[PDB]
Structure 1
Amino acid sequence: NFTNINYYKDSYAASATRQDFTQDPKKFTQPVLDSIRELSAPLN
């Protein structure tokens, strides 16, 4: 099982590299400045 081997001098001619599991969801779900707590009223 080895698909990280390239056959050319150029790097864009390879296959899919190591997968990245990064998942930042808070930049779309809570784009607010005051961090709203989980157990609180959002407005006071």
Structure 2
Amino acid sequence: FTNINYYKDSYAASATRQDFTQDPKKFTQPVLDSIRELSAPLN
């Protein structure tokens, strides 16, 4: 399964397990004051 490598090195293997860690708020909302969803952005 998944074609494990037969070598002493670790970079000669295939793609390892996937990682679904998106964390998209670092690009869409890069602000300090947490803007609420139902509110005005400016008071």
Please tell me whether the aligned partners of residues 4 and 17 of structure 1 are also in contact (alpha carbons under 8 angstroms). Answer: no
- Structure 2 spans left out of the alignment, 5+ residues: none
Moved over 3 A (4+): none
- Root-mean-square deviation (CA, aligned residues, Å) is 0.9
Q: Count residues in correspondence.
A: 43
TM-score normalized by structure 1? 0.91
Q: CA deviation at 1:3?
A: 1.5
Q: CA deviation at 1:4?
A: 5.0
Distance 2:36 2:3 in 1: 44
- Structure 1 spans left out of the alignment, 5+ residues: none
What whole-Å deviation, never above 9, does each CA across 1:1-44 have from its counterpart, x for those lacking one? Answer: x1251110000000000000111100000000000000000000
- Aligned-pair identity in percent equals 100
